[PDB]
Amino acid sequence: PVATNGERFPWQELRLPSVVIPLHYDLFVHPNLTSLDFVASEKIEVLVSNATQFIILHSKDLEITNATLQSEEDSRYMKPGKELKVLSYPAHEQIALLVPEKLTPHLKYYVAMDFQAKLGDGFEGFYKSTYRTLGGETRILAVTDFEPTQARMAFPCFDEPLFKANFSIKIRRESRHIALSNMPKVKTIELEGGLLEDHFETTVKMSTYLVAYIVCDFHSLSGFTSSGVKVSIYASPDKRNQTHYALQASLKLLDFYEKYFDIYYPLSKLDLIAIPDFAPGAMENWGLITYRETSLLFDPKTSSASDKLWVTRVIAHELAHQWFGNLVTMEWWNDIWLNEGFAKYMELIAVNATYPELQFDDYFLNVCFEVITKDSLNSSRPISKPAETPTQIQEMFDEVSYNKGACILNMLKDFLGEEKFQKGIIQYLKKFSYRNAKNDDLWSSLSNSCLESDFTSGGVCHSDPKMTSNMLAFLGENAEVKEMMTTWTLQKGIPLLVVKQDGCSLRLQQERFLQGVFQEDPEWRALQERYLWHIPLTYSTSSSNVIHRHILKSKTDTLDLPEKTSWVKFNVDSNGYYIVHYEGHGWDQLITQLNQNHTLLRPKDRVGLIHDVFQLVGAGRLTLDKALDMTYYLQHETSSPALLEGLSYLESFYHMMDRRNISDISENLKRYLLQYFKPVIDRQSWSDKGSVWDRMLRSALLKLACDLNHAPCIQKAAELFSQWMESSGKLNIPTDVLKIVYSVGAQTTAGWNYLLEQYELSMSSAEQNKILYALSTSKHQEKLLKLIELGMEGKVIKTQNLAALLHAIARRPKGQQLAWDFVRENWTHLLKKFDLGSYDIRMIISGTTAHFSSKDKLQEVKLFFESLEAQGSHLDIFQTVLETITKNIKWLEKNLPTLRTWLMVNTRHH
Amino acid sequence: XKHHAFSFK
Numbered sequence A: 001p002v003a004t005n006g007e008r009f010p011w012q013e014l015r016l017p018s019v020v021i022p023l024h025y026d027l028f029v030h031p032n033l034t035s036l037d038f039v040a041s042e043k044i045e046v047l048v049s050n051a052t053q054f055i056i057l058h059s060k061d062l063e064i065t066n067a068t069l070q071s072e073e074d075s076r077y078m079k080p081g082k083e084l085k086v087l088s089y090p091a092h093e094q095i096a097l098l099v100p101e102k103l104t105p106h107l108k109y110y111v112a113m114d115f116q117a118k119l120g121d122g123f124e125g126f127y128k129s130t131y132r133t134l135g136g137e138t139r140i141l142a143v144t145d146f147e148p149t150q151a152r153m154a155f156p157c158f159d160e161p162l163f164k165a166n167f168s169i170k171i172r173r174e175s176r177h178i179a180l181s182n183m184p185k186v187k188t189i190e191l192e193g194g195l196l197e198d199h200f201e202t203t204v205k206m207s208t209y210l211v212a213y214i215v216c217d218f219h220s221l222s223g224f225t226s227s228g229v230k231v232s233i234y235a236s237p238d239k240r241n242q243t244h245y246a247l248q249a250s251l252k253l254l255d256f257y258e259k260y261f262d263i264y265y266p267l268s269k270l271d272l273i274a275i276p277d278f279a280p281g282a283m284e285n286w287g288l289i290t291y292r293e294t295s296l297l298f299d300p301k302t303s304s305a306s307d308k309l310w311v312t313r314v315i316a317h318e319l320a321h322q323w324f325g326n327l328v329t330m331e332w333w334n335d336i337w338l339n340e341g342f343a344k345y346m347e348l349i350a351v352n353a354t355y356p357e358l359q360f361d362d363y364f365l366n367v368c369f370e371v372i373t374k375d376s377l378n379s380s381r382p383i384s385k386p387a388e389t390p391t392q393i394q395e396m397f398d399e400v401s402y403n404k405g406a407c408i409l410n411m412l413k414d415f416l417g418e419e420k421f422q423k424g425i426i427q428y429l430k431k432f433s434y435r436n437a438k439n440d441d442l443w444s445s446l447s448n449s450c451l452e453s454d455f456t457s458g459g460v461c462h463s464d465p466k467m468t469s470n471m472l473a474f475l476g477e478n479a480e481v482k483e484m485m486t487t488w489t490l491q492k493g494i495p496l497l498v499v500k501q502d503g504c505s506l507r508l509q510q511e512r513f514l515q516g517v518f519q520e521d522p523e524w525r526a527l528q529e530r531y532l533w534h535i536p537l538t539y540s541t542s543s544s545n546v547i548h549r550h551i552l553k554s555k556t557d558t559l560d561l562p563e564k565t566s567w568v569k570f571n572v573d574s575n576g577y578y579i580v581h582y583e584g585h586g587w588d589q590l591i592t593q594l595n596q597n598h599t600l601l602r603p604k605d606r607v608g609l610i611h612d613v614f615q616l617v618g619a620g621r622l623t624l625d626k627a628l629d630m631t632y633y634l635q636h637e638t639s640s641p642a643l644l645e646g647l648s649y650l651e652s653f654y655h656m657m658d659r660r661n662i663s664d665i666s667e668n669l670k671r672y673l674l675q676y677f678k679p680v681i682d683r684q685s686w687s688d689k690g691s692v693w694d695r696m697l698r699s700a701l702l703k704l705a706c707d708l709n710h711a712p713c714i715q716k717a718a719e720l721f722s723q724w725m726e727s728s729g730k731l732n733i734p735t736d737v738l739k740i741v742y743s744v745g746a747q748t749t750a751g752w753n754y755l756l757e758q759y760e761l762s763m764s765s766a767e768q769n770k771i772l773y774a775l776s777t778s779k780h781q782e783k784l785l786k787l788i789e790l791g792m793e794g795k796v797i798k799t800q801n802l803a804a805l806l807h808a809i810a811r812r813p814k815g816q817q818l819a820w821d822f823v824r825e826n827w828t829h830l831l832k833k834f835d836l837g838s839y840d841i842r843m844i845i846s847g848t849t850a851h852f853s854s855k856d857k858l859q860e861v862k863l864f865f866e867s868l869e870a871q872g873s874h875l876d877i878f879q880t881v882l883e884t885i886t887k888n889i890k891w892l893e894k895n896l897p898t899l900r901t902w903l904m905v906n907t908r909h910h
Numbered sequence B: 001x002k003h004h005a006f007s008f009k
Ligand SMILES: *[C@@H]1O[C@H](CO)[C@@H](O[C@@H]2O[C@H](CO)[C@@H](O[C@@H]3O[C@H](CO)[C@@H](O)[C@H](O)[C@@H]3O)[C@H](O)[C@H]2NC(C)=O)[C@H](O)[C@H]1NC(C)=O
Pocket: A024, A165, A166, A202, A203, A204, A205, A434
């Protein structure tokens, strides 16, 4: 169990020992941005719990040159001696410090080390990044990104989240740079040769993956929060203009979080910095939060309404992380969702409270629908789940940790009510401040939450409570909620609730929902097992808007309906993480209701119905003509979310058909959408006017009309593009329409070439983003390949965009094959650029394959994944893709003729 | 977050 120069490595586990406990790091870093390298040193105050001969910690790609142990409690190690023997075992990304004399329990020691490396050239660790000025200059910065396990690439340390420590950081630098880190600068001292040295305030207790530091020449705008935090937004100097919105939102959002959590942001400053080469969307380093420019920067001339929404989300997400993630950290990556599922959810609570005009509450169900896609296939995972390798740990960052965690939190907030739920949050954050929680710690605090403070006297909590039947009720309801939620986190999957109505005899069955595996299928029963959930149902009826609630704890059950009404709608507003299927004439009652008075169902009830009908089709519980029949009402629907839910299914089929050459069906879908929905599409201005929803309805519908080659639409955009290009940018395309205008513009070699030129000159990354989409809508293979090839270079088109670009090319008919070929003929090369690992590789793989729907393609993809296995290239996304392609195949052979027929029938009457 | 996706449209 041993490397490198022979000699046994004293330790076998990838998890570190618990024997030595870090307390404090002195960390000095001296980067040179001309020679693109750095020299560094550290001193780690450790406490030794049990006697040891060795210290195990993490270190990767670092050349350690000096190592010494000291102690003020253990005179054997009294200043200055002694040297440590250093042994490196790269396969666990560990090193061993060998001590001359067995360390003493309960004595503190100081581990000191010198190390050095080149600045990374790949998105992680302490790495090099570049940007372009308005003059055309090229500047360099050095930035850190450590989550999950890359801090060890920057300085040797105990790189696991449970090992929180104080960090005291110092940075030497040239006068043409500033240096930023987690904490405020205390002091800058002038050195002999003219260099400067920034000293930063010691951090509070925190995890290694959040340590951050940056050397750059960025500009900032500043403001103070109500509670007196200095919030600064940094960006390259020519872009300072674009940071205004971020300053405004982060102040407003930080204030809300302090009220909501009842806990102050503990640090005296908060920095948000727009990094030009940034792999993740954003990273929540405590006090120094890093973003993509597209995540932070906003520009009224070229950023759209949906750009604004996104920037607001991401800031909301990162600020939420200062509590969920930083203040309270998960014990180990198996509960990463404690961080991410929660930040994800706080987006909704915080944006809703601070910017209701953004309508984020109407968008949220999409968070849940996107997971359900993954969660209704066997290859899904439980929310909380073991993880060990860096690749495994990366894999935990997915729709299940984020969207599903958020969705089940939402479900529980609905159950407990806002007041009890926020109270649960507050005591959790307070109780675990500056250390760690695991899945159960969280469910205890949430299930034991006290309304109306504590409570009071002789209320249930706390002091001296009165023994009441009410008290007994409280205690058991609490334990109920605990049992319920743990099964939502340890069971993979989502349940289907099947509902049969017998006058007033509503009978309930629960079932694992399974996509493309029919009610009676060979393997269907084997996947049913002991999948059982405690499901907090809700429902209203046609004769009563009263919300009735009741917890289904077992496989089957019955409830009684006074008045024996027409329809019953389960899961009100879709706040529950489950699909509902109605037997008998239930679906016809609801569809009848929708065509006659849709308003009698709640707006979100409509969104969830539309969603469920089409899922169930795929589940073979309904036939495709039932779902298509529902979309008939959408002609009267003015609630944008349901309108867009419905449309998106019709649009999705069109691309599905169009991807194959099923042109007679795709043409009928084209004619059905432009004609049915002509009123709405024609109602839309080519402007930025109206409310946020108006603005987003517009870009949505006009994109759709332009995608179906609707002539007047294509004409208008073509005109706008022409005026723009002829005026050399001196005219303004309204932002909501920008991407559509550019892509129509890109259909000619002249327009295309012009756009690519604008790309290299533009100072709005949001604009660049839309341009790069446009170029990707090109019908010419020569162009799409050039895009791809440019992105390989990372010069003109930066490599943080390569994954998104292949994804964009692959989903259009002209691009899918080219993209699939490219990925297979350059896999080895893609891997030199990204971790296996990375969100990028996961996007590249799914982005180029998941849309496939033929047995042919299934074959090729099965063969490609089998091949990536050996080498030891394993990802969960392989199975997920195969089951997805399989889902699509079964869907086509099950429902395609029904689709063909339904459209032909619609042509006739009427 | 890496949910930069928002990848494109
Ligand atoms: C490492 O970080 C922890 C925080 O996680 C630091 O603990 C904090 O230390 C300060 C200073 O000792 C404490 O503040 C003091 O509190 C008392 C009463 O609250 C007040 O009268 C003093 O004027 C001062 O404000 C603070 O309570 C404490 N917080 C926690 C959670 O322990 C610790 O000091 C850091 N260690 C190093 C070496 O930097």
